[PDB]
Coordinates of C-alpha atoms and ligand atoms in Angstrom, one line a residue:
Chain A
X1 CA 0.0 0.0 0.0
X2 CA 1.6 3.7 -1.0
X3 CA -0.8 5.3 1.8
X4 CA 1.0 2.2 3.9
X5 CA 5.0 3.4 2.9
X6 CA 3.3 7.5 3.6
X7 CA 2.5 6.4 6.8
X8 CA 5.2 4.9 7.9
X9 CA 7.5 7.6 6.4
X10 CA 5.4 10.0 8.7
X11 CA 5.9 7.9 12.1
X12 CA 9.9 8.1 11.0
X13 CA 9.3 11.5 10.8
X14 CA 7.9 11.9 14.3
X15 CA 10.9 9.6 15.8
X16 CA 13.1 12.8 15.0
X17 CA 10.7 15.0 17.3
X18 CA 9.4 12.3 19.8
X19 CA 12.5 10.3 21.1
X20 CA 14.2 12.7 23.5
X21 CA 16.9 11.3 25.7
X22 CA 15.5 13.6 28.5
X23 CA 11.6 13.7 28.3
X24 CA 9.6 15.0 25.2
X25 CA 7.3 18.3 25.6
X26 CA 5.9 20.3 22.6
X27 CA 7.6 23.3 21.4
X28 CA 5.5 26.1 19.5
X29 CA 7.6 26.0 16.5
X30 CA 7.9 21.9 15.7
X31 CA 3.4 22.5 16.5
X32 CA 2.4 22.8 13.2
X33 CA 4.5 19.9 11.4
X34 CA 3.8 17.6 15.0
X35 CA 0.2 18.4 14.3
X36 CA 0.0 17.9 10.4
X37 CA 2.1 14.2 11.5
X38 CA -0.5 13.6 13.8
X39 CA -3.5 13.9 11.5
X40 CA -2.3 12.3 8.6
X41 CA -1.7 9.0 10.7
X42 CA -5.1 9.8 12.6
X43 CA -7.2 9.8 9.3
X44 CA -5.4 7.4 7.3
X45 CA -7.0 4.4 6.5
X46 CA -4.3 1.9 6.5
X47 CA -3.3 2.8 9.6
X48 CA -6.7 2.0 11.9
X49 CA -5.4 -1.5 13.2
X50 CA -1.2 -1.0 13.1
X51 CA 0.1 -1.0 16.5
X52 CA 0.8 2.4 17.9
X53 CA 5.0 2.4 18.5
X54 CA 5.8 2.2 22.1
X55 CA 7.7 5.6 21.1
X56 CA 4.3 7.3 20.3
X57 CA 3.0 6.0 23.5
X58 CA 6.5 7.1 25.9
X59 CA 5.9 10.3 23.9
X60 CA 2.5 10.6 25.0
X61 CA 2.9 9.7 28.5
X62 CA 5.8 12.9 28.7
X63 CA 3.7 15.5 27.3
X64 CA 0.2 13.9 28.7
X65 CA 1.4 14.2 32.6
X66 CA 3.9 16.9 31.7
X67 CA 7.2 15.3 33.2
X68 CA 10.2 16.8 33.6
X69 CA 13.4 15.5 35.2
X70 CA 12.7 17.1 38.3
X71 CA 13.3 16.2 41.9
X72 CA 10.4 15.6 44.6
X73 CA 11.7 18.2 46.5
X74 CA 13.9 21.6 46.1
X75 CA 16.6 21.0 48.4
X76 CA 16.4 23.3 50.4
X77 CA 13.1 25.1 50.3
X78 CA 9.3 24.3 51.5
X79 CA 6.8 23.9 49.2
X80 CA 0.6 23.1 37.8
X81 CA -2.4 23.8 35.8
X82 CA -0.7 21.7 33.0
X83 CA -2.4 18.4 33.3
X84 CA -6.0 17.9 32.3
X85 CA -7.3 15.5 34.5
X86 CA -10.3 14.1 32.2
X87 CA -11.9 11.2 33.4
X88 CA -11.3 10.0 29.6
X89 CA -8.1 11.2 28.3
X90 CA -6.6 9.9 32.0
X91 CA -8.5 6.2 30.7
X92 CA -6.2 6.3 27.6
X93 CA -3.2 7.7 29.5
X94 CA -3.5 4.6 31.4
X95 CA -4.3 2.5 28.3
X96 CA -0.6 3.7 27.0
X97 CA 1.3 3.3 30.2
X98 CA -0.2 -0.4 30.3
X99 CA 0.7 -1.0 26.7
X100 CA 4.6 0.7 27.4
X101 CA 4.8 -1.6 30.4
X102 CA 4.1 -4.8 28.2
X103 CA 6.2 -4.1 25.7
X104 CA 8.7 -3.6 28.4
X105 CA 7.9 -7.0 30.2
X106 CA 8.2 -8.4 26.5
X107 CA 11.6 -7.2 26.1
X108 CA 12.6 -8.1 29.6
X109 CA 11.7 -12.0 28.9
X110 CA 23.7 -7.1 31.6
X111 CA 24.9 -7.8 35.4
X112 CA 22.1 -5.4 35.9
X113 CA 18.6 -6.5 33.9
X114 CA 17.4 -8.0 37.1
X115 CA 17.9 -4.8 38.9
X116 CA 16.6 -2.3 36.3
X117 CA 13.5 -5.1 35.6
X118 CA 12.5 -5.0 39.4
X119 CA 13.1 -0.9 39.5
X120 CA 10.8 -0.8 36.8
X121 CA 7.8 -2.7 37.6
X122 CA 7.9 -0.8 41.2
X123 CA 7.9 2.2 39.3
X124 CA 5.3 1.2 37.4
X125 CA 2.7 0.3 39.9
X126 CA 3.8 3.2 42.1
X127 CA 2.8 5.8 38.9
X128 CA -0.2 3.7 37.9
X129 CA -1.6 3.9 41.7
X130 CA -0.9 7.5 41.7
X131 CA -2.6 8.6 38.0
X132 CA -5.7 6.5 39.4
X133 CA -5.8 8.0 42.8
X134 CA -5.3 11.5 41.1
X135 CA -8.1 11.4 38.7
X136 CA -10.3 9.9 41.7
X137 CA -9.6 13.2 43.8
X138 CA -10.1 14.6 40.6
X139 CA -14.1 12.9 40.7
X140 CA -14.3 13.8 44.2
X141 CA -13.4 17.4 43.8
X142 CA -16.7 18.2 42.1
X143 CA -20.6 19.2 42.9
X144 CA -22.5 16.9 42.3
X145 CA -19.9 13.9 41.3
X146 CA -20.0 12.1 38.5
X147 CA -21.1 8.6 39.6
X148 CA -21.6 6.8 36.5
X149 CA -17.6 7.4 35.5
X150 CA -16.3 7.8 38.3
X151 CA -18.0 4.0 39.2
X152 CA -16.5 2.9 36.3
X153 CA -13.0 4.8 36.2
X154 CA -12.2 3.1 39.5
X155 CA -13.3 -0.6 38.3
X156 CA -11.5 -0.6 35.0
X157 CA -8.0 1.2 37.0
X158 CA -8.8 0.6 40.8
X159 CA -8.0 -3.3 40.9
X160 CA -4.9 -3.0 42.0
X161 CA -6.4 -1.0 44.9
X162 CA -9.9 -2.6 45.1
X163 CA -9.8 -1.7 49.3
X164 CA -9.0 1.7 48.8
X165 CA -11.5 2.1 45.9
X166 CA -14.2 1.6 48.0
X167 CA -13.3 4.0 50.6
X168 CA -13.1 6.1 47.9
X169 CA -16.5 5.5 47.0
X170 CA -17.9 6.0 50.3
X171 CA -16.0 9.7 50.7
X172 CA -17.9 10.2 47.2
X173 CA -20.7 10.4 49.3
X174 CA -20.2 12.6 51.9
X175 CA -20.9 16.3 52.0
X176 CA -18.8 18.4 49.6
X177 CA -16.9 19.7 52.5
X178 CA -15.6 16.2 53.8
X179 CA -14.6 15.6 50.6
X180 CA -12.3 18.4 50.0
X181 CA -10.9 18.0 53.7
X182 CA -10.0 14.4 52.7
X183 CA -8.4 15.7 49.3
X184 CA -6.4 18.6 50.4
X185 CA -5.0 16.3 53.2
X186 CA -4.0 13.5 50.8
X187 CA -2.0 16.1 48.2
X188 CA -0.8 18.0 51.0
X189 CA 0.9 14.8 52.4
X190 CA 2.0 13.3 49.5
X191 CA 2.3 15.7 46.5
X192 CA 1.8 15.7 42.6
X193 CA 5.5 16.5 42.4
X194 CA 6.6 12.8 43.8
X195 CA 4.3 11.0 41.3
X196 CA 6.2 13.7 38.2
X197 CA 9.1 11.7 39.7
X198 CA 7.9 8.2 39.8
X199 CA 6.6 8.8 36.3
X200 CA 9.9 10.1 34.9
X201 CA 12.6 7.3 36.7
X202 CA 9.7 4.9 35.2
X203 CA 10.0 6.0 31.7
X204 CA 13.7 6.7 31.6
X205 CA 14.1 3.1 32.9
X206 CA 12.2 1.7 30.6
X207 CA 14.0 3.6 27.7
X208 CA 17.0 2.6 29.3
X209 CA 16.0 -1.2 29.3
X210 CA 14.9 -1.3 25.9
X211 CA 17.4 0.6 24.5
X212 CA 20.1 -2.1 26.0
X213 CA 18.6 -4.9 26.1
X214 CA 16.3 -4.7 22.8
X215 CA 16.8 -3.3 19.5
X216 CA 15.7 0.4 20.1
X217 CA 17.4 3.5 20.4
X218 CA 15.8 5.8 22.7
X219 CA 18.8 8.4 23.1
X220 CA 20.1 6.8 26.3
X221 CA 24.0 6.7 25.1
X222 CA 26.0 8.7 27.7
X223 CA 23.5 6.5 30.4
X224 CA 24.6 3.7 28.6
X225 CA 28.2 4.8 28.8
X226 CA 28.1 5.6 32.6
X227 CA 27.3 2.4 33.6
X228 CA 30.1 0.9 31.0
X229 CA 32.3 2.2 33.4
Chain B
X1 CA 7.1 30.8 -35.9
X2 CA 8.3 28.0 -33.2
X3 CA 10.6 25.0 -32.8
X4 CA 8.7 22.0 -33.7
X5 CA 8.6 18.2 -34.2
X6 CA 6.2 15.4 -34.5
Chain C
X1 CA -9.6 -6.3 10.3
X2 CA -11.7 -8.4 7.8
X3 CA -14.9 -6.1 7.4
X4 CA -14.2 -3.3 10.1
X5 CA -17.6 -1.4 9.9
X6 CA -15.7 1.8 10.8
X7 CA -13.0 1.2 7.6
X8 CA -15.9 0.3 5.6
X9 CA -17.6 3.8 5.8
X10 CA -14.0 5.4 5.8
X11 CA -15.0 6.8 9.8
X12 CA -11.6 7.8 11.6
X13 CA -11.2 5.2 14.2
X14 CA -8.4 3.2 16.2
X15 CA -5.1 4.3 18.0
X16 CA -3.9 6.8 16.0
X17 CA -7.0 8.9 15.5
X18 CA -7.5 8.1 19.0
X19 CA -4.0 9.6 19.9
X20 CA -4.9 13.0 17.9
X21 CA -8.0 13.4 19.5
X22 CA -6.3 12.9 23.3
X23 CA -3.2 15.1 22.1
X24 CA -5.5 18.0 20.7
X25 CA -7.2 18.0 23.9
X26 CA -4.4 18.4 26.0
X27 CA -2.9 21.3 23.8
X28 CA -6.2 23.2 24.1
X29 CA -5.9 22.8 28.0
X30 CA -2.3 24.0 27.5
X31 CA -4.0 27.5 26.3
X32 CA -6.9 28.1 28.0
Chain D
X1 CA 22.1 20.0 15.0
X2 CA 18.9 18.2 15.5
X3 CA 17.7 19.9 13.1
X4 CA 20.1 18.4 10.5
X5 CA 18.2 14.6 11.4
X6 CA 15.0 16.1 11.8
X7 CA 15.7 17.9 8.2
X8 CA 16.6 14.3 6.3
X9 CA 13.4 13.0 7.9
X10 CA 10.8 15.4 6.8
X11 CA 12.8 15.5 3.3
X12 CA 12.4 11.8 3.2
X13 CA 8.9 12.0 3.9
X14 CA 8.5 14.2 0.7
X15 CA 10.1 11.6 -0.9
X16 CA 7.4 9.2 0.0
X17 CA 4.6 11.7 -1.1
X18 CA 5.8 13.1 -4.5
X19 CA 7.8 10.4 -6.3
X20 CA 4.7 9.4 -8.5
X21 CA 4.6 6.1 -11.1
X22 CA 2.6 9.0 -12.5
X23 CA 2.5 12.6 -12.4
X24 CA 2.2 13.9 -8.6
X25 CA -0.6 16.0 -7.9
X26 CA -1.9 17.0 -4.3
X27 CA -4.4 15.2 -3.1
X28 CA -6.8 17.4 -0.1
X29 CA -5.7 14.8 2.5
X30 CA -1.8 15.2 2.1
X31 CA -1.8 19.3 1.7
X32 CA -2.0 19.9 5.1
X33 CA 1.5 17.6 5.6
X34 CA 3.2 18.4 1.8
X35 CA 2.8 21.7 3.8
X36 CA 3.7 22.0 6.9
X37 CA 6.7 19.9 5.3
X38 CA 8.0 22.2 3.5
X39 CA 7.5 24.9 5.5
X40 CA 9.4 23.2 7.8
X41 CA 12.1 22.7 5.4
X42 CA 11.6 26.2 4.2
X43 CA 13.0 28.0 7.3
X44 CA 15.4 25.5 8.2
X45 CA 18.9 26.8 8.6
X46 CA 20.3 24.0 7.9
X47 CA 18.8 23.3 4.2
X48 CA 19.3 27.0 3.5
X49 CA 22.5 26.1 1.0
X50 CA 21.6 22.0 0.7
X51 CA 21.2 21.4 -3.1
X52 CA 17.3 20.6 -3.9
X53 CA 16.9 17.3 -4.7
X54 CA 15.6 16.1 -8.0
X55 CA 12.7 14.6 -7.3
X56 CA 11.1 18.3 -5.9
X57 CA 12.1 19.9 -8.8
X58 CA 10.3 17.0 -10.6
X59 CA 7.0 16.9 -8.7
X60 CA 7.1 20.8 -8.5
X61 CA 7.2 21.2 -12.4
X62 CA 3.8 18.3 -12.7
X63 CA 2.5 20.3 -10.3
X64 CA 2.8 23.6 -11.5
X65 CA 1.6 23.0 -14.8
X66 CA -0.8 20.3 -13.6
X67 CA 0.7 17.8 -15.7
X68 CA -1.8 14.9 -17.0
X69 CA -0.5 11.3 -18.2
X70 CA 0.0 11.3 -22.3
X71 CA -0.1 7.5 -23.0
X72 CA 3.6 3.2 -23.5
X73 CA -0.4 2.0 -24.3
X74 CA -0.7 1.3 -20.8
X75 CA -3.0 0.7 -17.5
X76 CA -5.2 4.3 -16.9
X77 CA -5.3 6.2 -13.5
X78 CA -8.7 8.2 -13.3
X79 CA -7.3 11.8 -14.6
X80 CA -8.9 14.7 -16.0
X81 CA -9.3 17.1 -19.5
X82 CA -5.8 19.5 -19.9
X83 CA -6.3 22.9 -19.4
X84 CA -3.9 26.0 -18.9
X85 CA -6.3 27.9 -16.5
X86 CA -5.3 25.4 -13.9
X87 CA -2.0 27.0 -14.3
X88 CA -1.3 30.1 -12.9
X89 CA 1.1 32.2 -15.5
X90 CA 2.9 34.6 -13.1
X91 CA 6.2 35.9 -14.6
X92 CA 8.1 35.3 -11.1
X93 CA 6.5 31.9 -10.6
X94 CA 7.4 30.6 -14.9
X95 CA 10.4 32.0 -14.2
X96 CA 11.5 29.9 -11.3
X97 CA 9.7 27.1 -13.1
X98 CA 12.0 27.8 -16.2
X99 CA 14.9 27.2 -13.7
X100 CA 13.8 24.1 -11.9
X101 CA 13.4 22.6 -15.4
X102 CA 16.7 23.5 -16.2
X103 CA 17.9 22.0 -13.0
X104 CA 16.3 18.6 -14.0
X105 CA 17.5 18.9 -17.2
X106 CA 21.2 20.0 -15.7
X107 CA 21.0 16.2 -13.7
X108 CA 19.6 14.0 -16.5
X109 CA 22.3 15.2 -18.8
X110 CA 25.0 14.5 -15.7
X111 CA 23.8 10.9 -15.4
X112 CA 23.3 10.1 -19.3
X113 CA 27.5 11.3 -19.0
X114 CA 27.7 8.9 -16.7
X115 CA 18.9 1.4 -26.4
X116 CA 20.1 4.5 -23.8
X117 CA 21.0 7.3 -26.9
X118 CA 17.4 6.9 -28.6
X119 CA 16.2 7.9 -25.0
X120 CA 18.8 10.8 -24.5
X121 CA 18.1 12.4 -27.5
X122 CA 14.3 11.9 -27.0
X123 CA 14.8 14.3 -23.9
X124 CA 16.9 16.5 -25.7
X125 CA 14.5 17.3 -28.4
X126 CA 11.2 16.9 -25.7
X127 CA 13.4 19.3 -23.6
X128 CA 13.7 22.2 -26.3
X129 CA 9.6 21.5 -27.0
X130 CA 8.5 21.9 -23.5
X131 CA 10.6 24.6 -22.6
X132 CA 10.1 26.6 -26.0
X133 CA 6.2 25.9 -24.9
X134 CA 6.3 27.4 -22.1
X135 CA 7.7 30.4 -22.7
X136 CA 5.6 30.7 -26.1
X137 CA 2.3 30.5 -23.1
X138 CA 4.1 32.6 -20.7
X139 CA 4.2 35.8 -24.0
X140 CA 0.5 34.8 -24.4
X141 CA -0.2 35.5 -20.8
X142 CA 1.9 39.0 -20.5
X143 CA -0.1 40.3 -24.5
X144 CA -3.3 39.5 -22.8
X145 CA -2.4 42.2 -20.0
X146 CA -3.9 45.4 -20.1
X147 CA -2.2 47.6 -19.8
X148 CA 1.0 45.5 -20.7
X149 CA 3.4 45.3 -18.3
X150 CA 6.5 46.2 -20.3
X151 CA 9.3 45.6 -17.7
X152 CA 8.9 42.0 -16.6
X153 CA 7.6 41.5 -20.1
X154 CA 11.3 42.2 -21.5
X155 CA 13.6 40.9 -18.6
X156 CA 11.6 37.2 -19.5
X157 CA 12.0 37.7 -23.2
X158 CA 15.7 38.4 -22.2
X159 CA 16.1 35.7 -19.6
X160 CA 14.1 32.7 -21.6
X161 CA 13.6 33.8 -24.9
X162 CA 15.3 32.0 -27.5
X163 CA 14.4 34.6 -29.2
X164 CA 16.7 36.0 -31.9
X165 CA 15.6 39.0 -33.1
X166 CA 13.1 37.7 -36.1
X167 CA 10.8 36.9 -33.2
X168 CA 11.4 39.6 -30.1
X169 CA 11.2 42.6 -32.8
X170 CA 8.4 40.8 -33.9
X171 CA 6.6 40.3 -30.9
X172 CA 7.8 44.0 -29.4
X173 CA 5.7 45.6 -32.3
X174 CA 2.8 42.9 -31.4
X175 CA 2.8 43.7 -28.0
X176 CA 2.1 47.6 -28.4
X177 CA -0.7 46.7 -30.5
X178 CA -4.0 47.9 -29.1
X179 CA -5.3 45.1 -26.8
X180 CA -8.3 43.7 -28.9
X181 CA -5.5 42.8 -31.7
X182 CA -3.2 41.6 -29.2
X183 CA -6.4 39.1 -28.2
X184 CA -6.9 38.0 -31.5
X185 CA -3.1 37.4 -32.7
X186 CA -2.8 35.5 -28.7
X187 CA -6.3 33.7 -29.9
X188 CA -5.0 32.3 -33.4
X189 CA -1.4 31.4 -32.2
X190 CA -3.1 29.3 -29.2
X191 CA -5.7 27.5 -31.8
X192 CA -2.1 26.9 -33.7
X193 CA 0.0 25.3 -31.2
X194 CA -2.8 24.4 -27.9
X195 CA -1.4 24.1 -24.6
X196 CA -2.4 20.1 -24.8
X197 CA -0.2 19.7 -27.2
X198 CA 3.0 21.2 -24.4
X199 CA 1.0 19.3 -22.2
X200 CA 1.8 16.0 -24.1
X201 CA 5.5 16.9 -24.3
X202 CA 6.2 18.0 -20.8
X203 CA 4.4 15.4 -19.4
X204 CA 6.6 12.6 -21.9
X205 CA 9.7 14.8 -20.8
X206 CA 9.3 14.0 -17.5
X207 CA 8.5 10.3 -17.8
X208 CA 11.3 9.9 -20.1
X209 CA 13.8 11.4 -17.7
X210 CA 12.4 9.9 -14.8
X211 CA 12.8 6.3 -16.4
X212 CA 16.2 7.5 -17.8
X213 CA 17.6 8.4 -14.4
X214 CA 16.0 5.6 -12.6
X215 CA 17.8 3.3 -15.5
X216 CA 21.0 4.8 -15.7
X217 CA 21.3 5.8 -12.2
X218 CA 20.6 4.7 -8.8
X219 CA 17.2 6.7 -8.1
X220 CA 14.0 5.3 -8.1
X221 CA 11.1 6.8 -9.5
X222 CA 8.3 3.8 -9.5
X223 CA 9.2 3.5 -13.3
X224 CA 9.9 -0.4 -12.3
X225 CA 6.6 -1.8 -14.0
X226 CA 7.6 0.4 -17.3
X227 CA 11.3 -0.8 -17.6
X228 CA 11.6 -4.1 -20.2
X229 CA 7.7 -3.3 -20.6
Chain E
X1 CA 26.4 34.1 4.7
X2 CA 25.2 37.6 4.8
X3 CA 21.4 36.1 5.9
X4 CA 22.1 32.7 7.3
X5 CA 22.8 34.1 10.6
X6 CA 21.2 37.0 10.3
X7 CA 18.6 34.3 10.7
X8 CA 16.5 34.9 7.4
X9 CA 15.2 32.3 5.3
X10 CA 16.3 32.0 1.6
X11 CA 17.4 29.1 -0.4
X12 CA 16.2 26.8 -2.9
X13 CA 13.3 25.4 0.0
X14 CA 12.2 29.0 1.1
X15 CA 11.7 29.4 -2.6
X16 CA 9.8 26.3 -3.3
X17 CA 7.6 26.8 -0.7
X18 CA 6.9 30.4 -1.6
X19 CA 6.4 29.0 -5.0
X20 CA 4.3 26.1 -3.8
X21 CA 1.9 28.5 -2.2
X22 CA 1.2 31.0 -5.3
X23 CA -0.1 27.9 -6.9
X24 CA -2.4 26.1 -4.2
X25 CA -4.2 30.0 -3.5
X26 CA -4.7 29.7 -7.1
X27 CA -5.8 26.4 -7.2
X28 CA -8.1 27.2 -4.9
X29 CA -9.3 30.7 -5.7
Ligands
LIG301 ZN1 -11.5 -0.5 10.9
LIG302 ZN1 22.7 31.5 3.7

């Protein structure tokens, strides 16, 4: 198929712009031809059952939850209206980190693969508890909740936490002031900020893993040389 | 005129 | 697949188109 | 830089979308990507002083004078009628035409330098046709001006015309004839030598030099199904 | 060069794109 060879040309295109050896974020200028990529793939024909790249999806994950290689904490200092916590686009969000973590595992199946495979699926269930529990206090942030989604939200992405998904549903119905109590206290004790770094080690591990271990190049070289030493 | 051919 | 309904009538559906949509959204967020 | 790799990307991606079997014409569906790709290599830094490659000057001559197939007796893509008021005669824009031909004239005549001579000289001869053609619309287009522009009209004539005097005198007294005379000298040299007719030649230009250069060279130009055939 | 870094695009791709646009507002007009 020529619309086939297009389409592929185009995801090459977007590897240039994608694969960062930091994390990927979207700059003004590469907008319109990131954009244009983007649609072409989206409306094209041949492309409605291909597997999305697991570069599309790391890509997405960075500029979805906006990571950056940021620490926790500012060292020494005390202690964001960048990610759209939609009940839906979070669902997909979810959908690719589960997809990035089984292509992971799939690669996974040198002194140190043990060690970077364990980091990673820690990592991983540390960021997927955290997206989950994020878009619930998310649900339980409005008047009146959305019960129908939120219900749902917390079956499809709440199993690894089917204990604290019920609590969860019994704060959802308590007056609007309990419910913010409960919130604030939850983010005040353990902030967005650790889950940007959960979400970042998680996806430069995995880059790292695949990029050593498997056949892709995810700009991890002078990583790759550090631990050559 | 022009440069033609057939 | 074999007979997709969605390819049949040429509809935008599947990963990609369901990439764009999720990326457009969170680029409008990223304005107002 | 980056922008070097990201660069040779979105040039290969061109690639994919303009090398036609055929003549390339743009399709609704790919103009928003054809554009944004060149655009993109359009204020690149980097390609500022790279040399254009072939295949652009190619696919921007078929589209510029909306080239239609003019057939090896062979299979039928579902084309349209010729007609010149798909083409927009603009002194600047023929005139850049007029050197991008020239350009793809420049290579085939590098790579016939490296049977093959009936084939060279079949371009040669197409060449002086289509070009000659062109330049014969592009006086038709500046006598149908009122008031005739006088300046460009002359720098072409100079730049393009093959013109020895027995036709520039000539066509200097034609063009300060009064304009309905102009019209109907423009109307009988067009019923004389139509634009279909340029359209047959440029078109078989192009197919022969793309064949040539695939044949003779190493670039590909789909031609594959017309080679022994 | 006296407009590569004064950062102003020109070139054989500056040109083909202005080109490129003359004939699709035409096309489309
Ligand atoms: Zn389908
Ligand atoms: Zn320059």
């Amino acid at each position: 198929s020529n619309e086939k060879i297009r389409s592929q040309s185009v995801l090459n295109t977007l590897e240039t712009f994608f694969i960062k050896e930091n994390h990927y974020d979207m700059q003004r200028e590469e907008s319109s031809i990131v954009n244009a990529c983007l649609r072409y793939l989206g409306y094209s024909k041949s492309m409605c059952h291909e597997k999305m790249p697991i570069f599309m999806d790391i890509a997405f994950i960075e500029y979805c939850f906006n990571l950056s290689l940021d620490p926790s904490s500012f060292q020494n200092l005390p202690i964001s209206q960048q990610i759209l916590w939609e009940y839906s686009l979070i669902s997909n969000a979810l959908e690719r980190l589960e997809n990035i973590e089984l292509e992971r595992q799939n690669c996974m199946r040198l002194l140190n693969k043990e060690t970077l495979n364990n980091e990673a699926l820690k990592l991983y269930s540390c960021a997927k508890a955290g997206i989950c529990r994020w878009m619930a206090f998310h649900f339980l942030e409005q008047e009146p909740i959305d019960h129908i989604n939120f219900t749902k939200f917390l079956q499809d992405w709440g199993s690894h936490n089917e204990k604290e998904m019920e609590a969860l549903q019994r704060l959802s119905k308590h007056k609007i002031r309990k419910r913010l109590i409960y919130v604030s206290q939850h983010k005040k004790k353990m902030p967005w900020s650790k889950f940007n770094s959960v979400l970042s080690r998680y996806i430069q591990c995995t880059k790292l893993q695949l990029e050593v271990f498997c056949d892709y190049d995810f700009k991890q070289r002078e990583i790759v040389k550090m631990l050559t030493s | 005129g022009e440069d033609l051919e057939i | 697949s074999e007979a997709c309904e969605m390819c049949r009538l040429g509809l935008p559906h599947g990963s990609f188109f369901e990439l764009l949509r999720d990326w457009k959204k969170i680029e409008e967020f990223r304005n107002k």
